[PDB]
Short mmCIF file of C-alpha atoms (C1' of nucleotides) and ligand atoms in Angstrom, two decimals:
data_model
loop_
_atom_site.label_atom_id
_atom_site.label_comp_id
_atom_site.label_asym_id
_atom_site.label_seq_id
_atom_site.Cartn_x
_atom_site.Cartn_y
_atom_site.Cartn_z
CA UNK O 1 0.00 0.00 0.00
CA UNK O 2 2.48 2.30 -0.90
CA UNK O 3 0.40 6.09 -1.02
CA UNK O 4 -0.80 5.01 2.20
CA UNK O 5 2.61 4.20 3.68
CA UNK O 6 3.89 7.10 1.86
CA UNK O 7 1.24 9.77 3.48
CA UNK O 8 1.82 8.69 7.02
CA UNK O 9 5.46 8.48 6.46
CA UNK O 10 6.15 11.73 4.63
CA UNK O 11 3.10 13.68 7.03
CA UNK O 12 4.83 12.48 9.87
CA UNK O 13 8.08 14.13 8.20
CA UNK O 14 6.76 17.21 7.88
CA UNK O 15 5.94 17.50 11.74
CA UNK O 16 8.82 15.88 13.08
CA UNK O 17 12.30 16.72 11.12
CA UNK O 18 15.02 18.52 12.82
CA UNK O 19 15.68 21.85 12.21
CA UNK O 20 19.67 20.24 11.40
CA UNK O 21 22.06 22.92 9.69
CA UNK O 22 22.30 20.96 6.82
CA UNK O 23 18.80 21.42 5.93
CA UNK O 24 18.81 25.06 6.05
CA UNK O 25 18.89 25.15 1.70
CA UNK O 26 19.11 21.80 -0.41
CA UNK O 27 22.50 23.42 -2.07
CA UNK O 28 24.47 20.25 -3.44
CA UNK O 29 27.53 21.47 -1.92
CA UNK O 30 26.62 21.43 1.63
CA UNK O 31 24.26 18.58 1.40
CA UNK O 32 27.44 16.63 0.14
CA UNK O 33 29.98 17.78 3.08
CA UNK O 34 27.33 16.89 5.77
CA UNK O 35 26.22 13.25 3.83
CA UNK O 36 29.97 12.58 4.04
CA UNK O 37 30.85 13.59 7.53
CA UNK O 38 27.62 11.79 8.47
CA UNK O 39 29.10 8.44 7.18
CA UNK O 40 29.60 6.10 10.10
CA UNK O 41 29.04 9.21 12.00
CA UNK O 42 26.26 10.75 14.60
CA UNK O 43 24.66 13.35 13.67
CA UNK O 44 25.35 14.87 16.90
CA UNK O 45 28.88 14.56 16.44
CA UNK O 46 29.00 16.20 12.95
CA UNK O 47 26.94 18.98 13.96
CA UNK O 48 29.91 21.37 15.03
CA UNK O 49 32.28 20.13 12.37
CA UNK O 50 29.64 20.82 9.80
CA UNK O 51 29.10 24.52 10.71
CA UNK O 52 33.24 25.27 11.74
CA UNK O 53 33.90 23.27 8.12
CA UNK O 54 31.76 25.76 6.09
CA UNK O 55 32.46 29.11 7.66
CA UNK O 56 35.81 28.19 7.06
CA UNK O 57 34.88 26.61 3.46
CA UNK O 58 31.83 28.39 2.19
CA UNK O 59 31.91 27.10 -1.69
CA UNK O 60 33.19 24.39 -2.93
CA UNK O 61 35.84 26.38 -4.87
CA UNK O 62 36.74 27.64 -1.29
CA UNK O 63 37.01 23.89 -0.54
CA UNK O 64 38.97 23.31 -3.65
CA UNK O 65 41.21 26.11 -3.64
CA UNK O 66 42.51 25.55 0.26
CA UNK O 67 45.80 23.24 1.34
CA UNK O 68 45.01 20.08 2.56
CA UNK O 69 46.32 20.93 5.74
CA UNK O 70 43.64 23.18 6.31
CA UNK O 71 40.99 20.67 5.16
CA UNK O 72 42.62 17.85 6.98
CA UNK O 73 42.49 19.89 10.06
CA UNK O 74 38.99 20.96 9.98
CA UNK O 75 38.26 17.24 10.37
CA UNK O 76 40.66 16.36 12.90
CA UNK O 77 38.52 14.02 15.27
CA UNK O 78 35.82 13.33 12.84
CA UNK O 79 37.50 9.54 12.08
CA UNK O 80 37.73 8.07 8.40
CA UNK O 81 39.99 10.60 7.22
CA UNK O 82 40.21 9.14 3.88
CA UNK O 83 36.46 10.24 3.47
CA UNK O 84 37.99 14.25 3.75
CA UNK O 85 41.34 13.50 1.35
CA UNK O 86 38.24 11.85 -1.49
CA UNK O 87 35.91 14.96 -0.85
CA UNK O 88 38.97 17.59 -1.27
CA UNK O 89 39.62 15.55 -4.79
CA UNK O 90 36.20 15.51 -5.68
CA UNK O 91 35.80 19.06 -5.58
CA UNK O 92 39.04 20.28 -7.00
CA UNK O 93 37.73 17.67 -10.17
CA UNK O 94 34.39 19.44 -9.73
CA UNK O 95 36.05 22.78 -10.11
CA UNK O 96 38.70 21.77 -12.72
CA UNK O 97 36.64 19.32 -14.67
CA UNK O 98 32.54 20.58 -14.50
CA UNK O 99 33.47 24.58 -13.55
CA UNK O 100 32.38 24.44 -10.22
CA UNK O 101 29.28 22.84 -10.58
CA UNK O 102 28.40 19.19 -8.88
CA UNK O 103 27.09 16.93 -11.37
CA UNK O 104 23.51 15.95 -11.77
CA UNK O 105 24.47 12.78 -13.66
CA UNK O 106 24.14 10.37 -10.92
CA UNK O 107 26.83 7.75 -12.91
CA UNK O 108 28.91 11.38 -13.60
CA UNK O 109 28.77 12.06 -10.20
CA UNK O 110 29.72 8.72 -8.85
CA UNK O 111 33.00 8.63 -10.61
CA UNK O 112 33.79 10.98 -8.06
CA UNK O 113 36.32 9.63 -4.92
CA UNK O 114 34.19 9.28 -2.03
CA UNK O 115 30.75 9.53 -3.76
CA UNK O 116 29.07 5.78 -2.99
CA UNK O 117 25.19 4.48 -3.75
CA UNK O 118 23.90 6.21 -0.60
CA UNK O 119 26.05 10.03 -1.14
CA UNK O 120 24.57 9.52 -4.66
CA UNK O 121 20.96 9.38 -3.65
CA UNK O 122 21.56 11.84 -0.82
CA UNK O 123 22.78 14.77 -2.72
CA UNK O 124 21.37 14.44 -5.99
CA UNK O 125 17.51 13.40 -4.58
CA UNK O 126 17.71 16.47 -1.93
CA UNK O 127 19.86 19.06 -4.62
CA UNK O 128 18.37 18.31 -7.67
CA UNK O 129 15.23 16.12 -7.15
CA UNK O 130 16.84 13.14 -9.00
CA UNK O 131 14.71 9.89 -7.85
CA UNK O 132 17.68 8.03 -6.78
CA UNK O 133 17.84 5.73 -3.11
CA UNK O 134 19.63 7.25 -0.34
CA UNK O 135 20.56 3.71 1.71
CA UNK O 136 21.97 4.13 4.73
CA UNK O 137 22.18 1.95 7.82
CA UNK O 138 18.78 3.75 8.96
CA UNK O 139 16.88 3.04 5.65
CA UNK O 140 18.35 -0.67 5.69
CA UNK O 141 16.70 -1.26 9.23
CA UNK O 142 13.73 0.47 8.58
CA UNK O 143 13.06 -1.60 5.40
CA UNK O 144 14.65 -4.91 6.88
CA UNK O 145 11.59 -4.46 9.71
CA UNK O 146 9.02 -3.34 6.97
CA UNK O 147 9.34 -5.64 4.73
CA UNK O 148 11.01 -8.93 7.25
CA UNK O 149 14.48 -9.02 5.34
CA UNK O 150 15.98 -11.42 7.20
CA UNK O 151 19.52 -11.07 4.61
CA UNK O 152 22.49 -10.44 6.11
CA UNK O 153 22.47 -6.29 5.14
CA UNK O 154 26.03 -6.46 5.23
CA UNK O 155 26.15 -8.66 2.38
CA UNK O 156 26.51 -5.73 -0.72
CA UNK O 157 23.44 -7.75 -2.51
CA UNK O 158 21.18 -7.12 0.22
CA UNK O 159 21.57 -3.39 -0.40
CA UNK O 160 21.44 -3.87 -4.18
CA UNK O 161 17.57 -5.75 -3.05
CA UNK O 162 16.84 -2.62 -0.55
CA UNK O 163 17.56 -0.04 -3.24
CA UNK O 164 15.08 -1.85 -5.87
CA UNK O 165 12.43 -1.88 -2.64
CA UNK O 166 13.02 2.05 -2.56
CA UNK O 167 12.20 2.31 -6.31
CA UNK O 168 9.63 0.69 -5.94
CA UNK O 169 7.52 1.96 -2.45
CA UNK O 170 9.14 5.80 -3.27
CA UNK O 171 7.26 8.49 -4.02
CA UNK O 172 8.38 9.64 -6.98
CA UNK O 173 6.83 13.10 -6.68
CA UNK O 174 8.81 13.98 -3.68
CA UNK O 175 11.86 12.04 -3.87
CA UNK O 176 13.90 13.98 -1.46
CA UNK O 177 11.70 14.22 0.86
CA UNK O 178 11.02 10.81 0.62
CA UNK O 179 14.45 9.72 1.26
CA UNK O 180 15.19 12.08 3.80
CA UNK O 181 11.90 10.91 6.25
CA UNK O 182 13.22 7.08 5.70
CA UNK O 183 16.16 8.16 7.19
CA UNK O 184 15.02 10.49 10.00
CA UNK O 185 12.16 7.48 10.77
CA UNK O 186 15.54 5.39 11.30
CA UNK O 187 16.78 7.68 12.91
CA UNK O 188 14.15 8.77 15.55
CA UNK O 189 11.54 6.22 15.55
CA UNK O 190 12.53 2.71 14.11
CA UNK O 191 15.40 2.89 16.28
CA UNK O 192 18.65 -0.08 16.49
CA UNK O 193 17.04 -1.21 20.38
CA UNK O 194 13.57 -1.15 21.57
CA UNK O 195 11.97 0.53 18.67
CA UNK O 196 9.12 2.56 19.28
CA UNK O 197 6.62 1.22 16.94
CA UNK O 198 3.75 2.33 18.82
CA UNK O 199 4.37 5.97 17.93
CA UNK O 200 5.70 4.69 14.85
CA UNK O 201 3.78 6.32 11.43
CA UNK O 202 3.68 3.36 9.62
CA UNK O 203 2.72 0.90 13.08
CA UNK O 204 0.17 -0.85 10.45
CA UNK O 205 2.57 -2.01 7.14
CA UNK O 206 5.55 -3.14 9.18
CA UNK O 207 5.58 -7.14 8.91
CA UNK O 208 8.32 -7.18 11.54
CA UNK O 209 6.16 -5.48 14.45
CA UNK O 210 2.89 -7.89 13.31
CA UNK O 211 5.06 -10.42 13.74
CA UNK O 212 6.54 -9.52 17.13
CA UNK O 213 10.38 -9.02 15.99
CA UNK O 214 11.34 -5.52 15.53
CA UNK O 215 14.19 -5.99 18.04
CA UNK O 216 15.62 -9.45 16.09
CA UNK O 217 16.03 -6.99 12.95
CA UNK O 218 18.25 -5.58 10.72
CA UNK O 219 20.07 -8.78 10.19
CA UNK O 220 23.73 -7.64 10.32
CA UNK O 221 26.85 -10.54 10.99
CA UNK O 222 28.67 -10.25 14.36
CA UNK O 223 31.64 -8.12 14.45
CA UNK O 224 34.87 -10.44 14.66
CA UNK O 225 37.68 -9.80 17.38
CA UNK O 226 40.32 -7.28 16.33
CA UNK O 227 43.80 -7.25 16.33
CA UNK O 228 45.93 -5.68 19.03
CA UNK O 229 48.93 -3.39 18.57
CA UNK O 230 51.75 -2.31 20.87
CA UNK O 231 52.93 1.41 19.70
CA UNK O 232 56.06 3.14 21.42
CA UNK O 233 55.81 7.13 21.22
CA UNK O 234 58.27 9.44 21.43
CA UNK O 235 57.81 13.17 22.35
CA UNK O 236 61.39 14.63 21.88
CA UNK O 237 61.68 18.53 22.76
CA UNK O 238 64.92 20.42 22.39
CA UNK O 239 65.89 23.42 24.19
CA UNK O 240 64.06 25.88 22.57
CA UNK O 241 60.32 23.85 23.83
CA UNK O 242 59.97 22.44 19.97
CA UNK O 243 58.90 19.45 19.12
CA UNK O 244 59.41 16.61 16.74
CA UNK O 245 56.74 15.67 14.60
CA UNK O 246 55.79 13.89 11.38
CA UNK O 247 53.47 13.44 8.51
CA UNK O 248 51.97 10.11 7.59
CA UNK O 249 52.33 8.47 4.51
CA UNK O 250 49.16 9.78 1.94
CA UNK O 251 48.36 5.46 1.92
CA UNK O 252 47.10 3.57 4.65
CA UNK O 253 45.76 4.14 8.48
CA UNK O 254 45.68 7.41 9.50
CA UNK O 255 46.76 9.07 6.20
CA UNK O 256 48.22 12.43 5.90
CA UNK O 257 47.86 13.35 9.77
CA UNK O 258 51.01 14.68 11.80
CA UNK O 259 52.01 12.45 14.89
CA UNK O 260 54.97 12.23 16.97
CA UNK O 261 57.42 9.82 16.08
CA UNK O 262 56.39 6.08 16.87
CA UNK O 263 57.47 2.27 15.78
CA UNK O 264 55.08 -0.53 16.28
CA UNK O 265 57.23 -2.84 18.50
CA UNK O 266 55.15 -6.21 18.38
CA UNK O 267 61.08 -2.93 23.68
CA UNK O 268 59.74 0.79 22.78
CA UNK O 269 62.91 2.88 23.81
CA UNK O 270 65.75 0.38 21.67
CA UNK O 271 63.51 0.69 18.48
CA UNK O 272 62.22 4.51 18.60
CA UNK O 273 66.32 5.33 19.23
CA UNK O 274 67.09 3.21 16.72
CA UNK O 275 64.59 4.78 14.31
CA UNK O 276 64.73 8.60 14.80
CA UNK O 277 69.04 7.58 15.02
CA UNK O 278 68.55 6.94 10.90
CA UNK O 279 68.22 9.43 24.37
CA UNK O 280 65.03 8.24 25.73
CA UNK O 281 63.33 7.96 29.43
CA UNK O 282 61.69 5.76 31.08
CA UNK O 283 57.62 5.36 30.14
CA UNK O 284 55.35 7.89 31.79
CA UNK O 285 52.08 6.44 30.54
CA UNK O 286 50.47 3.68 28.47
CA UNK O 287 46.89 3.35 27.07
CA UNK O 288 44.85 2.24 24.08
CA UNK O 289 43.08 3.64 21.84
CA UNK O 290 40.31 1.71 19.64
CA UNK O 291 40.04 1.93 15.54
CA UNK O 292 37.65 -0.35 13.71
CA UNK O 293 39.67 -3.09 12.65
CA UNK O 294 42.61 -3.36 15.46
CA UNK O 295 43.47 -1.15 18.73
CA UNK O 296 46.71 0.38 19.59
CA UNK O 297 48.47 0.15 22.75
CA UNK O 298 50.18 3.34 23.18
CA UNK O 299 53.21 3.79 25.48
CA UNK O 300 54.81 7.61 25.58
CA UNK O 301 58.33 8.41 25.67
CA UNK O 302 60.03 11.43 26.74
CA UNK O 303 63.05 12.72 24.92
CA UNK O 304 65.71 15.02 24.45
CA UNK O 305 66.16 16.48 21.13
CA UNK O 306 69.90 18.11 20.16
CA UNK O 307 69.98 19.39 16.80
CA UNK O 308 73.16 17.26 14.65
CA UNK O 309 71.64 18.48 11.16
CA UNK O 310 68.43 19.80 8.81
CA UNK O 311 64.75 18.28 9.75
CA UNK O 312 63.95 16.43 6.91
CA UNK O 313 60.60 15.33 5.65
CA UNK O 314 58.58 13.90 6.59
CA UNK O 315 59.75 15.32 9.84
CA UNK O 316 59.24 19.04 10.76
CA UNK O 317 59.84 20.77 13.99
CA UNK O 318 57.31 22.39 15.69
CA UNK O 319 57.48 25.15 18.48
CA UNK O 320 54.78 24.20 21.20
CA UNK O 321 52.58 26.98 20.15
CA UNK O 322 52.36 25.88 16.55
CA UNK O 323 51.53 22.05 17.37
CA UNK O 324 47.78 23.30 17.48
CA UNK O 325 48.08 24.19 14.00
CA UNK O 326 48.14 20.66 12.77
CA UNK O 327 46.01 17.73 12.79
CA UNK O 328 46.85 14.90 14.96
CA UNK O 329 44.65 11.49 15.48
CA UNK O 330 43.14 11.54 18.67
CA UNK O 331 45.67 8.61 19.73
CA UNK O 332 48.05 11.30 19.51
CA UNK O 333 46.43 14.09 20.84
CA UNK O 334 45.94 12.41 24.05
CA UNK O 335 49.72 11.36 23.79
CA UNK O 336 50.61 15.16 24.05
CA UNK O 337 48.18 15.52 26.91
CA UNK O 338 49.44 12.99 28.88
CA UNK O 339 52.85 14.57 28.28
CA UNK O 340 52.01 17.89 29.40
CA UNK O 341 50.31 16.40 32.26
CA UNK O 342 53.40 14.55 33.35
CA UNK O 343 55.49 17.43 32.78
CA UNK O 344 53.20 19.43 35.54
"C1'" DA W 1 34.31 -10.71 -0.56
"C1'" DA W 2 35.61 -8.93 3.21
"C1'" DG W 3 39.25 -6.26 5.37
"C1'" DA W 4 40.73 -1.51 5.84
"C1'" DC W 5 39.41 2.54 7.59
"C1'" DG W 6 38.29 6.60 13.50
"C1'" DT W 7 35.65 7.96 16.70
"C1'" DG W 8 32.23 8.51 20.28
"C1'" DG W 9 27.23 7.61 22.22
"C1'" DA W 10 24.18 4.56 24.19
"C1'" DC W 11 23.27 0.36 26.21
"C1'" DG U 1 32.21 -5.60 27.25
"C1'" DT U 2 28.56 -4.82 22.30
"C1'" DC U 3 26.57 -2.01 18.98
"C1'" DC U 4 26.61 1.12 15.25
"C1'" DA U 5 26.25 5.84 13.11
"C1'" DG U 6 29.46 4.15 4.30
"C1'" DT U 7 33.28 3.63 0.66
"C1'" DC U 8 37.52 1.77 -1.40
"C1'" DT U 9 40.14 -1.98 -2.43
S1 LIG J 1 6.15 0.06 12.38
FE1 LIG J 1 8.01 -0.07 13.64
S2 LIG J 1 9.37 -1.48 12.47
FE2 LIG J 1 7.74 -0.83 11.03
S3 LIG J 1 8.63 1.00 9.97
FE3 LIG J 1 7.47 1.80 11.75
S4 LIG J 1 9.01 1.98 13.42
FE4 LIG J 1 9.92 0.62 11.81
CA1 LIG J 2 31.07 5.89 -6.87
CA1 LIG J 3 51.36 3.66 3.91
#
DNA sequence: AAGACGTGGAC
DNA sequence: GTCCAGTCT
């Protein structure tokens, strides 16, 4: 029944949205910064990066035109970093390739780094009104419930089956809107734990809640053990208060940030001598710190820096003062913390 | 295919 | 502790 579902759905929409800064215009730019800080990301979370990012980047040629320190830095703490080194290419192609303007092509547009099925539908159904799906981990619960997909939604296939199910129930008239109340209703009302189907608009087509098994749904594998990973830090100041720091390779974890020194050690002090060699202290602290797919366990150094030649790259040195100016993972922000700390 | 890829809320 | 808010390879 898919104008009924549709009326109470997008009705529903109209009284409950939040007033969220991204929804102050449908302009493609900013509705593509905030649907990429919003992947695996809260929207609570991404509110202050979204408004600091575009007061400091107002256009996308402002995006496009600015180093990508500055870019990396406005998203220092967001996670997924490679999502902000994609967007910075995808707007200096938008600029050099299309003038400026984001593509309404969805297949043009996906070419793009960092533009996947669900940033397709998200910018070009709210910018330009183009009927495409906007899947996201809310839509994929919501329709796993509706409709009693049991698939595993990790599986790429069942999102390939939930994006012909949105073709389908959509309302083509108001595809944006459409898209965007699927989400929110994920979002606010067909939520991960106890769901709240009895406020819910659409209480009456949901299979799932007939049946009694909201909760047991979306159907989504169990996350596998990660590995663990013992990192030795050093923090080595010279006389002057400066500080040794590096950039990260542009491939791999963390790419692109500064960080002090470090070596994964699978002793700490032998191997970070023997690595900024090509004299250390004992620890002061040791912690961990989670990513995805492994954890590190930290361990911080202090050392004393004497200058026997030029800094070379990737390695800079930094007075304290101008260590704010660059973009650290949070791993390492807490390092200098707990460094300053001790040093109290 | 499934591992890589950050971080922080809410249970 | 678990869960979970997308894309590239
Ligand atoms: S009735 Fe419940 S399970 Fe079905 S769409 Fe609404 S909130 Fe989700
Ligand atoms: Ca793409
Ligand atoms: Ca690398």
């Amino acid at each position: 029944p898919a104008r009924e579902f549709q009326r109470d759905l997008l009705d529903w929409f109209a009284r409950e949205r939040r007033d969220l800064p991204w929804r102050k215009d449908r302009d493609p730019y900013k509705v593509w910064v905030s649907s990429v800080m919003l992947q695996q990301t809260r929207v609570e979370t991404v509110i202050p990066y979204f408004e600091q990012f575009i007061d400091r980047f107002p256009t996308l040629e402002a995006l496009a035109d600015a180093d990508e320190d500055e870019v990396l830095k406005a998203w220092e703490g967001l996670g997924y970093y490679s999502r902000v080194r994609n967007l910075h290419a995808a707007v200096k192609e938008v600029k050099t390739r299309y003038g400026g303007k984001v593509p309404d092509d969805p297949d043009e547009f996906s070419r793009l780094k960092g533009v996947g099925p669900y940033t397709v539908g998200a910018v070009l159904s709210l910018a330009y009104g183009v009927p495409e799906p906007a899947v996201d981990g809310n839509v994929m619960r919501v329709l796993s419930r509706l409709f009693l997909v049991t698939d595993d939604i990790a599986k790429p296939s069942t999102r390939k089956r939930f994006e012909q199910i949105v073709r389908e129930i959509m309302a083509y008239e108001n595809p944006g809107a459409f898209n965007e109340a699927l989400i929110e209703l994920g979002a606010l009302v067909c939520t991960p734990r106890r769901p709240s189907c009895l406020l819910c608009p659409v209480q009456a087509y949901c299979q799932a809640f007939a049946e009694g098994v909201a909760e047991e749904l979306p159907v989504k594998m169990k996350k596998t053990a990660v590995k663990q990973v013992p990192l030795a830090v050093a923090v080595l100041a010279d006389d002057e208060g400066r500080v040794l720091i590096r950039k990260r390779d542009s491939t791999g974890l963390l790419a692109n940030l500064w960080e002090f020194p470090s070596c994964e050690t699978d002793d700490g002090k032998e191997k970070l001598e023997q690595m900024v060699g090509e004299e250390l202290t004992e620890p002061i602290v040791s912690f961990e710190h989670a990513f995805s797919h492994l954890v590190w366990q930290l361990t911080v150094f202090p050392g004393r820096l004497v200058h026997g030649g030029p800094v070379e790259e990737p390695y800079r040195l930094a007075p304290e003062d101008e260590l704010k100016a660059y973009a650290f993972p949070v791993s390492h922000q807490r390092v200098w913390r707990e460094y300053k700390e001790w040093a109290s």
